[PDB]
């Protein structure tokens, strides 16, 4: 019979009072297995090819050499190579933990629990001060954690003394006398002096794994600043930058989940403790990366001053609440998410009161859950809001004509008699807003180049322009609407007709007509170099053909003539048909 | 003075006590202050110089803090060190007090002390819940206060259960026979759920003895909101307005010292406790009304956008710090007070970075001490700041003429081509700024009439004008300066002369024997300035024109002025008609 193999989990060197299991692996199938400890029968396991020997809570006596044997009814033969099980004792140093938090109001108590691995009857808590205060407690035994502990209630805490606690344990009459001390647990006292001002230089919202600093500047007689996280964390700083005034540095290399939450600066000085700082809430983003939210604005990203505006942030994921932020700073408050039964979206409408110039900026929305208020989602694609104002209306004129072809490039241009430092272009129905600086032309007024790429079907619409000053943050009023029309998209093609003679006199009249057998809702007259708004007429169909009369009264030589006519439908108000054969009239 | 008690400060019940107020000086009257309680008058006619305050048969109500004052008729000054008078009861009912504060972090302990005046050996602390938790402690005896007490450490506190503690006392040999309970002390748990938003409708800064409301709106699954003052106070509200959402009402009839400090809203609901609200700091003003501070601005109450500006608030009293407020809201932070050794003033300079339109408003400054950060002084006389902007320059014209004499009323008028909703007038060197509504004249531009009272010597100066829009908070640029000149202030009167002919188809001269620095020509129009060259001890000035037109025909007068006052003119000069 082949020799068996004995395994141990965990490793052969185990700490005291920890469960261990002996695994006896054998390829043959054995009716029973026998574990021999130091040459004596210790255990016997029957059935279940591998058998286990569980030794929960290993004591010092259980340490030694072990052997496993496997047996069949017909024969047993093999003894395994012995594996030495070694038990390691525990340290005598006790553990001192603020059972609630180091925060204490003046004249109050904070409960501290001191645990250790001693059979010692009594524990001691001492405070580092001119007078030495001691508390003596008996050791209680917790059967679940298998550890001896004792709770202390230090106090009453006076706001003039610095409280640093250390724990000791001993027995009354044993040679080893006292145990080594625990780690110093310092209490945070809510004094009566003036509160320090806590700030965050990068901001209160930081993406994960990035650096940030937390500084609180308080009284000039301070000595030590404490940065207490409400997630039960505490950082201590003594060396503070003296210039200018007392400023306590707290640096975090990379933000994680354990660094988010509310923070308060506690301050001890020459005149005692001080009132705690304001609750600065830190927020770590970059979690929940899969479902990025999306934000949009109604009715337009540019609204008049003092008007209704509703921002809409929704996500396919079941977020609990949505929070809006402007720039890197929090904005407004949190709103619950509403589950639309149809669109499968969790919605939240950020209704805003009468608009103010302060609302102008860059908005983002985040998603998070109630159980983790400081763990936000990935930021959403930014949505820029620009509230208009009551300044003088700039003018938006277009080189190269209104009605364009796909193969030409349009560069929009906005100017204003008032010296505006910056101009903004907006397309009605769009979301993005383009901002360009203004250059001082020789005529003395500002001019902004708004370059636009190759004209495509999307480019047609309505463009408005706004002005602003450098120091100012309030934008101007809207500029007169600008209709950009795109030709050559609709298959239908109209035909043009002229009523009278080609050579009309300086006072003659001409009613022209463009008609088409195919259905056309509106017709548009175009002039060569039509920098002017083309004339739009609805179409009245006497025959199966749609037609429209563009009457001309008291024509002049400047009006050389009218050349092409275009068709349009109600489905797309500003996407025009192809051109009609040109017709040149001469006055 | 020193206040003595016989017997000791801790007296048995129903026993007579006497207060001795010993003072080396002789005082006409004595006043005992409890927490004015009694007054004995001895106008030195009485032999003894010390007065007694007999409190026969002391009950529980007499316990508290006591102060004695001694006064001379001409002055009173001294308060004595308060001696805590403790009355000891014999009854069974115990008292339960949160030794620190009801605030608890989830999974922690809060120490509660239960004291009583009985010889009961054991105390019990019970929590009001479905599961019954009990703590049994032996009574420790304090020999100083002669009262039996026992400390309890309730916990661990779970953020899912509502913790309401009541204390009982009993005897060891018999159980189930408890004494009546103490007042229910409910712990405030710092949960992990979403934090409520705490607000104050009137504001965070309120004058004393006035009413205010504190509302915190949190989760819609809440049940009870707790408003905990960091001065160890707690208000509980259950009935909340359902529409719209859960809103907890907290009303205070009159604000006092005990209502100031930082407040936080703790919230318990169906899903457990929640993180406490933000630390809303309440401040009660109207205290220290004796020494009102004063605030001023340099260089001018109207500065250009993005410029240096320093606000100066000082007071004769030794305040620790000064705080600036805009409107009813706090602004900036606190600044230490600097004791100027010469002017006996405690100074604080509020330096402001590059100006922003948000700084436009109404500023006040308060004084307070470090030991009481929420007890501020009486508000100072307001100082209004109006930051200018980059809008189009308005125009400033004056009906009824520029140069006026006293006993006349001047109505200033400011217009601008841009539709401005509101106009503001400023006088260079002044502090106040006048704001008027705008009138839309038929010409298409806005116009504001700025009425000025009876013209006096002080009223002369330099007035500027600014424009604004309703929705906007950014003001316009400055309007061209307007110099107002006052006639009839200097006794000397100059004379004018014309050389050629009465009927011109010419350099004029205004002369004065007395020393005169500058001369001012006036048209019966922007006045003309002439410097004086002193030939033969007389001052004179020639005004050349190099050309003449029909419009220039008129009556021209000259006034005198000195460098000491640029806008205080002399009396009128005899007319000369061209
Ligand atoms: C704004 O755009 C125009 C063109 O889009 C710039 O230049 C003018 O271009 C037209 C024809 O394209 C010429 O007839 C003009 O003579 C050009 N003007 C000048 C001054 O060269 C114009 O310069 C742009 N503005 C700025 C500040 O770059
Ligand atoms: C066309 O115009 C010419 C002159 O321009 C005129 O003589 C002629 O009669 C006109 N004919 C018609 C048909 O209108």
Of the residues B98, B111, B445, the best mutation for testing chain A's interface (the one with the most A CB atoms within 10 Å of its CB) is B111
Pairing of strands A40-46, A110-116: unpaired
Nearest Cα of chain A lies from the Cα of B210 at a distance, in angstroms, of 25
CB B326 within 8 A of CB B358: no
E runs forming strands in B143-256 = 147-154, 164-170, 185-186, 188-190, 197-200, 205-207, 212-217, 222-229, 233-237, 247-248, 251-252
d(CA A161, CA B320): 23
CA A448 – ligand 1 centroid, Å: 10
d(CA A573, CA A521): 9
Q: What is the DSSP string of B413-482?
A: EEEESS--SEEEEEETT-S--EEEE-EE-TTSSEEEEEEEEE--GGG-SEEEEEEE-SS-----PPPPPE
Which residues does chain B have within 8 Å of residue A358's beta carbon, measured at their own beta carbons?
A: 358
User: What is the 8-class DSSP label of residue A357?
Assistant: G
A76 & A105 share domain: no
Q: Please give the tally of structural domains in chain A.
A: 5
Quick one: closest CA in A to B389, which residue?
A: A472
CA A501 – ligand 2 centroid, Å: 6
Quick one: closest CA in B to A355, which residue?
A: B471
Q: What is the DSSP string of B311-332?
A: EEEEESS--SEEEEEETTEEEE
Of the residues B97, B98, B100, the best mutation for testing chain A's interface (the one with the most A CB atoms within 10 Å of its CB) is B100
Which two tokens mark A493? 């093609």
| Residue pointed to by tokens 């024969």 | A75
Closest listed residue to residue A148, CA positions, set A178, A183, A181, A118: A118
Intra-chain end-to-end CA distance of chain A, in Å: 123
Quick one: closest CA in A to B356, which residue?
A: A471
Asked if residue A413 has its Cβ within 6 Å of ligand 1, the reply is: yes
CA angle B243, B247, B252 (to 5 degrees): 125
| Residue pointed to by tokens 């309890």 | B152
CA angle B431, B437, B438 (to 5 degrees): 120
A248 & A304 share domain: no
Which two tokens mark B117? 């005046």
Least CB–CB distance from A100: residue in B105, B357, B472: B105
CB A206 within 8 A of CB A285: yes
d(CA A483, CA A522): 15
B227 & B312 share domain: no
B169 & B238 share domain: no
Cβ neighbors of A341 (< 8 A, separation 6 or more) are none
Which two tokens mark A49? 């090819």
Of the residues B109, B195, B282, the best mutation for testing chain A's interface (the one with the most A CB atoms within 10 Å of its CB) is B109
Closest listed residue to residue B519, CA positions, set B496, B551, B553: B496
CA angle B74, B77, B82 (to 5 degrees): 145
Contact B471 A155 (CB under 8 A): no
d(CA A293, CA A314): 6
Asked if residue A503 has its Cβ within 6 Å of ligand 2, the reply is: yes
Contact B100 A111 (CB under 8 A): no
Quick one: closest CA in A to B190, which residue?
A: A230
CB A535 within 8 A of CB A568: no
Contact A389 B279 (CB under 8 A): no
Q: Which residues pair with B57 in a beta bridge?
A: none
- Measured from the alpha carbon of residue A451, the closest ligand is 1
Distance of alpha carbon B573 from the chain centroid: 53
A266 & A197 share domain: yes
CB B564 within 8 A of CB B516: no
Peptide bond between residue A485 and the one before it cis (omega within 30 degrees of 0): no
Which is it for the CA torsion B138, B140, B146, B149, positive or negative?
Answer: negative
Alpha helices by DSSP H, listed for B255-401, are none
Which two tokens mark B126? 């019970």
CB B22 within 8 A of CB B1: yes
* 3-class SS string, A537-551: EECECCCCCEEEEEE
Nearest atom, ligand 1, residue A411 CA: 5
d(CA B367, CA B287): 10
CA A503 – ligand 2 centroid, Å: 7
**How far is the CA of A580 from the CAs of A168, A324, A467, A511, B410, in angstroms?**
101, 51, 39, 17, 70
Gyration radius (Cα) of chain B, Å: 38
Closest listed residue to residue A69, CA positions, set A99, A31, A126: A31
Name the structure determination technique. Answer: X-ray
Determine, yes or no, domain membership for A46.
yes
Asked if residue A411 has its Cβ within 6 Å of ligand 1, the reply is: yes
Quick one: closest CA in B to A97, which residue?
A: B108
Least CB–CB distance from A105: residue in B194, B232, B305: B232
Q: Which residues pair with B266 in a beta bridge?
A: B226
Which two tokens mark A346? 């969790």
Cβ neighbors of B573 (< 8 A, separation 6 or more) are B493, B494, B495, B496, B510, B557, B558, B559
Determine, yes or no, domain membership for A157.
yes
B423 & B466 share domain: yes
Which residues does chain B have within 8 Å of residue A473's beta carbon, measured at their own beta carbons?
A: 357, 474
CB A526 within 8 A of CB A537: no
d(CA A502, CA A586): 6
3-state secondary structure of A258: helix
Contact A357 B473 (CB under 8 A): yes
Determine, yes or no, domain membership for A555.
no
d(CA A423, CA A393): 12
Q: Ligand 1, atom 21: nearest CA belongs to which residue?
A: A441
Nearest atom, ligand 2, residue A501 CA: 14
**How far is the CA of A364 from the CAs of A153, A314, A329, B399, in angstroms?**
48, 12, 10, 54
E runs forming strands in A27-175 = 32-37, 40-46, 51-55, 64-71, 76-79, 83-88, 95-98, 103-105, 110-116, 122-127, 134-138, 140-142, 147-154, 164-170
Peptide bond between residue B7 and the one before it cis (omega within 30 degrees of 0): yes
Which two tokens mark B472? 């906007």
CA A441 – ligand 1 centroid, Å: 10
Distance of alpha carbon B496 from the chain centroid: 58
Nearest atom, ligand 2, residue A505 CA: 5
Which two tokens mark A10? 């965990």
CB B494 within 8 A of CB B511: yes
Which residues does chain B have within 8 Å of residue A369's beta carbon, measured at their own beta carbons?
A: none
Nearest Cα of chain A lies from the Cα of B111 at a distance, in angstroms, of 6
- Measured from the alpha carbon of residue A449, the closest ligand is 1
**How far is the CA of B188 from the CAs of A372, A522, B523, in angstroms?**
20, 71, 81
A441-467 per-residue burial string, b: 16 or more CB within 10 A, e: under 16: eeeebbbbebebeebeeebbbebbbbb
Provide the domain limits for residue A305: 294-387
User: What is the 8-class DSSP label of residue B64?
Assistant: B
Contact A105 B230 (CB under 8 A): yes
Which residues does chain A have within 8 Å of residue B97's beta carbon, measured at their own beta carbons?
A: none
**How far is the CA of A479 from the CAs of A413, A473, A516, in angstroms?**
12, 18, 35
Nearest atom, ligand 1, residue A442 CA: 20
A183 & A197 share domain: no
Which is it for the CA torsion B486, B487, B493, B498, positive or negative?
Answer: positive
Resolution stated for this PDB structure, in Å: 3.4
d(CA B388, CA B472): 12
Determine, yes or no, domain membership for A75.
yes
| Residue pointed to by tokens 């006993």 | B407
A105 & A145 share domain: yes
User: What is the 8-class DSSP label of residue A503?
Assistant: B
Q: Ligand 1, atom 7: nearest CA belongs to which residue?
A: A449
Closest listed residue to residue A487, CA positions, set A583, A563, A542, A411: A563
Domain end position, chosen among B254, B285, B316: B285
B278 & B209 share domain: yes
d(CA A9, CA A55): 11
Of the residues A111, A219, A320, the best mutation for testing chain B's interface (the one with the most B CB atoms within 10 Å of its CB) is A111
Asked if residue A449 has its Cβ within 6 Å of ligand 1, the reply is: yes
Q: Where on the phi/psi map is residue A543: left (φ > 0), alpha (ψ -120 to 50), or beta?
A: beta
Contact A197 B371 (CB under 8 A): no
User: What is the 8-class DSSP label of residue A366?
Assistant: E
What is the longest distance spanned by two Cα atoms in chain B? 132
User: What is the 8-class DSSP label of residue B161?
Assistant: S
Closest listed residue to residue A417, CA positions, set A395, A434, A387: A395
Q: How many residues does chain A have?
A: 587
Q: Ligand 2, atom 10: nearest CA belongs to which residue?
A: A501
d(CA A124, CA A167): 6
Which two tokens mark B160? 């899912």
Determine, yes or no, domain membership for A159.
yes
> B104: how many CB neighbours lie within 10 A of its CB?
27
Q: What is the DSSP string of A122-136?
A: EEEEEE-SSS--EEE
Main-chain dihedrals φ then ψ at residue A259, nearest 5 degrees? -100, -10
d(CA B135, CA B152): 7
Q: Which residues pair with A298 in a beta bridge?
A: A310
A182 & A248 share domain: no
d(CA B554, CA A490): 76
d(CA B315, CA B380): 10
CA A581 – ligand 2 centroid, Å: 23
Distance of alpha carbon B231 from the chain centroid: 22
CA angle B347, B350, B353 (to 5 degrees): 155
What burial class does residue A232 get, using C-beta atoms within 10 Å of its C-beta: 0-12 exposed, 13-18 middle, 19+ buried?
Answer: middle
Q: Which residues pair with A350 in a beta bridge?
A: A311
Q: Where on the phi/psi map is residue B306: left (φ > 0), alpha (ψ -120 to 50), or beta?
A: left
Which is it for the CA torsion A480, A484, A485, A489, positive or negative?
Answer: negative
Which is it for the CA torsion B175, B176, B182, B183, positive or negative?
Answer: positive
Asked if residue A501 has its Cβ within 6 Å of ligand 2, the reply is: yes
Counting ligand 2 atoms within 8 A of each CB, the residue from A499, A501, A508, A585 with the most, and so the one to mutate, is A501
Determine, yes or no, domain membership for A529.
no
A383 & A400 share domain: no
Domain end position, chosen among A88, A121, A136: A88
Asked if residue A447 has its Cβ within 6 Å of ligand 1, the reply is: yes
Which two tokens mark B463? 């007035």
d(CA B538, CA B560): 13
Q: How many residues does chain B have?
A: 578
CB A390 within 8 A of CB B469: yes
| Residue pointed to by tokens 């989940």 | A257
What burial class does residue B157 get, using C-beta atoms within 10 Å of its C-beta: 0-12 exposed, 13-18 middle, 19+ buried?
Answer: buried
* 3-class SS string, A439-458: EECCCCCEEEEEEEEECCHH
d(CA B462, CA B566): 10
d(CA B264, CA B198): 7
Give CA torsion, residues B377, B380, B382, B385, to 10 deg: -80
Nearest Cα of chain A lies from the Cα of B3 at a distance, in angstroms, of 27
Strands laid side by side in the B495-497 sheet: B495-497, B508-512, B538-543, B533-535
Which is it for the CA torsion B396, B398, B401, B402, positive or negative?
Answer: negative
| Residue pointed to by tokens 């009138």 | B439
CA angle B495, B571, B567 (to 5 degrees): 115
Pairing of strands B568-570, B555-561: unpaired
Determine, yes or no, domain membership for A545.
no
Q: Where on the phi/psi map is residue A232: left (φ > 0), alpha (ψ -120 to 50), or beta?
A: left
Closest listed residue to residue B240, CA positions, set B252, B226, B255: B226
d(CA B272, CA B106): 11
CA A500 – ligand 2 centroid, Å: 9
CB B151 within 8 A of CB B137: yes
Contact A370 B108 (CB under 8 A): no
Kind and range of the H or E run holding A311 = strand A309-315
| Residue pointed to by tokens 């009284």 | A219
Pairing of strands A510-516, B10-12: unpaired
Distance of alpha carbon B359 from the chain centroid: 17
Q: Ligand 1, atom 12: nearest CA belongs to which residue?
A: A399
Domain end position, chosen among A65, A88, A111: A88
Which two tokens mark A540? 């009245």
What is the longest distance spanned by two Cα atoms in chain A? 132
Q: Which residues pair with B198 in a beta bridge?
A: B216
CATH number of the domain where residue A337 is located? 2.60.40.10
What burial class does residue B209 get, using C-beta atoms within 10 Å of its C-beta: 0-12 exposed, 13-18 middle, 19+ buried?
Answer: exposed
A468 & A416 share domain: yes
> A329: how many CB neighbours lie within 10 A of its CB?
10
d(CA B567, CA B570): 10
d(CA A182, CA A179): 9
Q: Ligand 1, atom 5: nearest CA belongs to which residue?
A: A411
């Amino acid at each position: 019979l082949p020799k068996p193999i004995l395994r141990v989990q965990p490793d052969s060197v185990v700490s005291r009072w920890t469960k261990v299991t002996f695994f006896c692996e054998e390829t043959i199938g054995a009716n029973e297995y026998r574990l021999y400890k130091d040459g004596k029968l210790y255990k016997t396991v029957t059935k279940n090819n591998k058998a286990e020997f569980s030794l929960s809570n290993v004591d010092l006596s259980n340490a030694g050499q072990y052997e496993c044997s496997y047996s069949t009814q017909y024969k047993s033969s093999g003894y395994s190579d012995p594996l030495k099980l070694v038990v390691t004792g525990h340290y005598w140093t006790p553990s001192l933990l603020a059972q609630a938090s180091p925060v204490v109001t003046s004249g109050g108590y904070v409960t501290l629990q001191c645990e250790s691995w001693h059979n010692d009857h009594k524990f001691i808590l001492t405070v580092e001060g001119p007078q030495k205060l001691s508390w003596t407690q008996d050791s209680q035994y917790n059967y679940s954690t298998r550890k001896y502990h004792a709770l202390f209630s230090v106090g009453p805490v006076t706001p003039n003394q610095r409280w640093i606690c250390r724990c000791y344990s001993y027995d009354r009459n044993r040679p080893y006398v006292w145990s080594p001390p625990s780690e110093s647990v310092e209490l945070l006292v809510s004094g009566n002096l003036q509160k320090p001002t806590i700030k965050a230089e990068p901001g209160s919202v930081i993406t994960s794994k990035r650096a940030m600093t937390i500084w609180c500047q308080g009284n000039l007689d301070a000595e030590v600043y404490f940065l207490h996280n409400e997630g039960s964390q505490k950082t201590q700083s003594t060396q503070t930058l003296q210039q200018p005034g007392n400023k306590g540095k707290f640096f975090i290399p990379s933000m994680t989940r354990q660094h988010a939450g509310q923070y308060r600066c506690y301050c001890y000085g020459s005149a005692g403790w001080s009132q705690p700082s304001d609750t600065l809430e830190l927020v770590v983003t970059g979690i929940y990366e899969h479902y990025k939210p999306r934000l949009s604005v109604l009715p337009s990203p540019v609204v008049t001053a003092g008007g209704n505006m509703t921002l809409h942030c929704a996500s396919d994921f079941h977020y609990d609440k949505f929070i809006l932020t402007k720039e890197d700073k929090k904005f407004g408050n949190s709103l619950d998410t509403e589950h639309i039964s149809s669109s499968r979206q969790y919605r939240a409408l950020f209704i805003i009161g009468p608009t103010t110039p302060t609302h102008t900026g860059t908005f983002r929305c985040y998603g998070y859950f109630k159980n983790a208020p400081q763990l936000w989602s990935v930021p959403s694609d930014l949505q820029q809001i620009l509230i208009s104002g009551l300044s003088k209306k700039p003018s938006l004129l277009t080189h190269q004509g209104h009605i364009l072809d796909p193969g030409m490039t349009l560069t929009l241009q906005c100017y204003s008699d008032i010296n505006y430092d910056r101009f903004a272009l907006h397309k009605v129905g769009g979301a993005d807003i383009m901002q360009h600086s203004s250059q001082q032309t020789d005529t003395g007024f500002s001019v902004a180049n708004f370059t636009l790429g190759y004209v495509s079907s999307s480019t047609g619409g309505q463009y408005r322009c706004y002005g602003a000053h450098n120091l100012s943050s309030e934008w101007s009023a809207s500029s007169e609407p600008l209709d950009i029309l795109i030709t050559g998209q609709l298959p239908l093609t109209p035909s043009l007709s002229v009523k009278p003679n080609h050579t009309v006199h300086s006072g003659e009249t001409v009613s022209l007509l463009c008609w088409s057998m195919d259905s056309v809702d509106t017709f548009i007259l175009s002039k060569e170099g039509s920098a002017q708004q083309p004339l739009r007429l609805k179409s009245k169909s006497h025959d199966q053909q749609s037609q429209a009369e563009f009457s001309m009264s008291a024509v002049t030589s400047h009006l050389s003539g009218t050349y092409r006519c275009y068709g349009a439908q109600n489905s797309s108000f500003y996407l025009l048909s192809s051109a009609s054969a040109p017709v040149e009239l001469t006055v």
